[PDB]
Design a protein around this ligand. Structure first.
Ligand SMILES: [U]
Ligand SMILES: [U]
Ligand SMILES: [U]
Ligand SMILES: [U]
Ligand SMILES: [U]
Ligand SMILES: [U]
Ligand SMILES: [U]
Ligand SMILES: [U]
Length: 517
């Protein structure tokens, strides 16, 4: 943390953050969500990290070079250590990226190495070559070299993500799936794991072996798993929570802006809220049905009337303000809702649905006051506008993600936030073979458009291809875009270091500090 001249620090440097839900895991290769990544950034540190404003910056690698954007060489700082005192080396990264790639690990983020185009990853994911053929090597203990199959000028931006953080081989190998328990885990970030009580709390304590430990200020941070946004706000206002999770309750938000304006942080956020359609399950394999659902949803009611927190009506998957996005707003988005409603009704009537044999399906969401309120509103809008019936179903976070991967669903509430600020951080998840493709969308036309983006060495041609890829996605109505998020959360006045400037919201508790109060 960089504490400004003249700020008086509190004697007690502890922080309590709400984290939305119980994490899927603390293993960097088994996680895919925001709550998981929130904890992962304090415990495991990769090659690069985001600074306090979100720019990719030195992490374990103090400096790096690239040859033709294909061969990337990372110079690892000599004093990088794990919490047990042992050095962090390039061998740790070699083992770790191989483990990520290995199909036996079944990482939801195995395809992150396809997004970076690391040599031989397609063959490794497919079981054709062993994980040891991945194009990574330790040239020495402090030098990690990555070889890509084609030039990727933005490759280094990918490297702040938890899936490419190192994991300690000896603990993994010795304890298997219990390696992340507090008695066994070993970490290389600014913190170490102290306590982990499922559905209660995660408590982290400063890691004195962290190379940048002298600049860490917070000695202990607790992450809570509260999925009720009302409850989070309540325990924030009671004094227990210093930073809410960034999901705000419809019940209280308007009141909060008038009651504690200075605590209500609202900043840009590269995330999209949408209804994910299971594209492989009838009748959702019919484009007429998917298009009907997309068009009948009334974003103006949802965004400005029911939620009204500053979100923007969405017409794409990639947020339009992503670095490199130059998207074309489709003509349907400019129509009246009435006109969208008629076309929708028309498509379902065309698809064989009637008042007597209507369209009935489930709407799955992760337990939340916000998602439940939005799902009820969407259910009523779809009922009223299109005559479709929906059965709402909530599931806890971890189970919810597994259901989507399983494909044991119809429609699910969903949100995707960028892992790196470039359109492919969204678009790559809709590739036929992506491990993150829970829409189960498979389009050769879409796959080809994205494959072509690294076959040109021109930024405008690349941006035109992303725009066309979004148009392919939209034409197929793979999903139902709802709104682009704003990052809205409450932060006590004594919490220093949170700028709100990072559109990815990659917070590190090592950058924060408690002001005397
Ligand atoms: U004190
Ligand atoms: U650049
Ligand atoms: U940029
Ligand atoms: U269903
Ligand atoms: U509620
Ligand atoms: U460039
Ligand atoms: U105080
Ligand atoms: U105090």
């Amino acid at each position: 943390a960089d504490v400004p001249a003249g700020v008086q620090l509190a004697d007690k440097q502890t922080l309590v953050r709400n984290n939305g839900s119980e994490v899927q895991s603390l293993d960097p290769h088994k996680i895919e969500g925001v709550p998981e990544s929130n904890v992962s950034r304090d415990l495991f540190e990769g090659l690069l990290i985001s600074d306090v404003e979100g720019h990719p910056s030195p992490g374990v690698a103090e400096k790096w070079e690239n040859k033709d954007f294909k061969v990337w060489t990372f110079h690892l700082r000599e004093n990088a250590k794990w919490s047990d005192g042992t050095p962090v080396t390039a061998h740790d990264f070699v083992y770790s990226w191989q483990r990520l790639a290995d199909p036996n690990t079944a990482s939801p983020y195995a395809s992150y190495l396809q997004y970076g185009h690391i040599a031989n990853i397609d063959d490794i994911i497919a079981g054709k070559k062993p994980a040891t053929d991945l194009g990574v090597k330790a040239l020495d203990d402090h030098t990690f070299e990555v070889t890509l199959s084609e030039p990727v000028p933005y490759f280094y931006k990918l490297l702040v993500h938890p899936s490419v953080s190192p994991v300690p081989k000896s603990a993994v190998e010795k304890f298997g799936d219990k390696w992340t328990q507090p008695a066994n885990i070993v970490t290389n970030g600014a913190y170490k794991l102290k306590n982990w009580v499922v559905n209660e709390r995660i408590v982290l304590e400063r890691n004195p072996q962290y190379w940048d430990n002298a600049k860490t200020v917070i000695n202990q941070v607790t992450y809570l798993p509260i999925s009720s946004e009302v409850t989070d706000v309540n325990r924030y206002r009671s004094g227990e929570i210093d930073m809410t999770y960034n999901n705000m309750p419809i019940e209280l938000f308007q009141k909060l802006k008038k009651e504690i304006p200075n605590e209500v942080r609202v900043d840009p956020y590269l995330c999209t809220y949408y209804y994910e359609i299971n594209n492989q399950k009838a009748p959702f394999n019919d484009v007429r049905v998917r298009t009907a659902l997309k068009l009948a949803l009334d974003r103006d009611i949802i965004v400005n009337k029911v939620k009204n927190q500053g979100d923007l009506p969405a017409y794409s998957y990639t947020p339009p303000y992503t670095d490199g996005a130059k998207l074309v707003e489709p003509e349907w988005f400019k129509w009246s809702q009435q006109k969208r409603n008629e076309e929708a009704k028309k498509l379902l009537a065309e698809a064989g649905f009637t008042a007597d044999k209507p369209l009935t399906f489930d709407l799955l969401y992760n337990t939340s006051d916000l998602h439940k309120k939005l799902a009820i509103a969407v259910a009523s809008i779809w009922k009223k506008n299109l005559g479709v019936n929906v059965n709402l179903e909530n599931q806890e976070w971890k189970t919810f993600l597994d259901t989507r991967h399983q494909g044991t669903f119809d429609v699910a509430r969903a949100g995707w936030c960028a892992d790196y600020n470039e359109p492919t951080s969204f678009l790559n998840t809709m590739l036929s073979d992506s491990s993150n493709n829970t829409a189960h969308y498979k389009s050769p036309a879409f796959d080809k458009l994205i494959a072509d983006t690294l076959k040109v060495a021109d930024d405008t041609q690349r941006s035109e291809l992303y725009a066309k890829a979004e148009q392919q996605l939209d034409k197929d109505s793979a999903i139902v875009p709802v709104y682009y998020y704003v990052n809205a959360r409450l932060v006590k006045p004594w919490v220093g270091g949170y700028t709100g400037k990072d559109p990815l919201d990659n917070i590190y508790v090592k950058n924060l500090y408690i002001i005397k109060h």
